[PDB]
Amino acid sequence: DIELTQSPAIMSASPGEKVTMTCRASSTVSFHYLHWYQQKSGASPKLWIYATSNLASGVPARFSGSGSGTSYSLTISSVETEDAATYYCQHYSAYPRTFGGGTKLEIKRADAAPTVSIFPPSSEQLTSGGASVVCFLNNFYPKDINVKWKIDGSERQNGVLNSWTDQDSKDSTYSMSSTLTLTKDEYERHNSYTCEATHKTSTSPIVKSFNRNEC
């Protein structure tokens, strides 16, 4: 039994910082065959470093790899937005798993407020007896955003389902959708529907709203 352990499982860094991540084996492993792969969100892995220290074709100069025996590392000399990804080490001698558990790298940026868009339920959806009110919160930072729903002025928590995208490697932003699902009847017993966006350090929420009678 020999395992590759990667640390840290999750890292956050700012553009320009030097970052190092490690891959450690239970027992000695040949440096000739220690490899690294990069995987970006919604895409398959790409070969990144082979035989410990050699960069694969097209891989930026800022990447490097070191190590031998039971101890290896990947280093980015000056991290960039496009480096947001999960990094996996790999060795054929490792068993029963040839891959490490990975290091997920997040890239910091200055705070960005979401672009907020609220949608009344599709009229065609109402025909099914269900009503999904949708609010998109697009291109914001940091990840920890708070969404509040209001119906006729009062907060509603039941029937809300939220989903975040992975970090965009182009601009370091996140996006999320918030969906409030009600019955057709419950929906039509109310007029004002509100999606509110806030974060910890905010003193002014972003508010989007519609009325059932007039648009």
Binding site: Y33, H35, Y37, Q39, A43, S44, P45, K46, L47, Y50, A51, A56, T86, Y88, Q90, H91, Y92, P96, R97, T98, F99, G101, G102, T115, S117, I118, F119, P120, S122, S123, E124, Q125, S128, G130, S132, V134, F136, N138, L161, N162, S163, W164, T165, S175, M176, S177, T179, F210, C215
Partner: protein, 212 residues
């Protein structure tokens, strides 16, 4: 350029069988070892099998006895046949040039496989029109299994789109997609949501039309 395209992913009952294919181009296929690697919903990467250019096979202990890796050097096709499928075989499957020793230098974009006794439910697709720039939505509701493929104007609108990970409730998935275009381009010009659900062999096009 080197290209690897996987196909054959589907919903399959436990105990069933399924064949994955990987079509290779842009290199001399007969000179290279080839591999399959899977990725679980937990994002864990897991080697499945490899085959040398001479046809020698190697399998992970998880699939030994059940999976067959094979190749056709004339057609430039790498295959994986999975028999006696298990729930635990549910994953995204990728085809690679190379193998574990000298590394896997190119990877295809993969095919999804889910092993479940639950039957397929195709999605209901609903347009989201608003109640300088305009954002429009597409709601794809109540389907099983993952994945759906969501595009806008048959992939012509690439930038300004956000497709959100599906949420599971009552044994059914629901996802939404947003697209943002210049307000001079809609409703002036057509914006339509295209949804593909391979497991139910369904495609749905839904034009986003003005009104609520």
């Amino acid at each position: 350029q080197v290209k690897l395209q996987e196909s054959g992913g589907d919903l399959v009952k436990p105990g069933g069988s399924l064949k994955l294919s990987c079509s290779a181009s842009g290199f001399t296929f007969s000179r290279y070892a080839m591999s399959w690697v899977r990725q679980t919903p937990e994002k864990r990467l897991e080697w499945v099998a490899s085959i040398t250019n001479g046809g020698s096979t190697y399998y992970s202990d998880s699939v030994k006895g059940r999976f067959i890796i094979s190749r056709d050097n004339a057609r430039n096709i790498l295959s994986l046949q999975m028999s006696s499928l298990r729930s635990e075989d549910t994953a995204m499957y990728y085809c690679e040039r190379g193998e574990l020793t000298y590394a896997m230098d190119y990877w295809g974009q993969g095919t999804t496989v889910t092993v479940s006794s639950a039957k397929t439910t195709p999605p209901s697709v609903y347009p989201l029109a608003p109640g300088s720039m305009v954002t429009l939505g597409c709601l794809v509701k109540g389907y099983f299994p993952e994945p759906v493929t969501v595009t806008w104007n048959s992939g012509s609108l690439s930038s300004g789109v956000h497709t959100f990970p599906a949420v599971l409730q009552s044994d059914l998935y629901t996802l939404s997609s947003s697209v943002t275009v210049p307000s001079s381009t809609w409703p002036s010009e057509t914006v339509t949501c295209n949804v593909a659900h391979p497991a139910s062999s369904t495609k749905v096009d839904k034009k986003i039309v003005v009104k609520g």
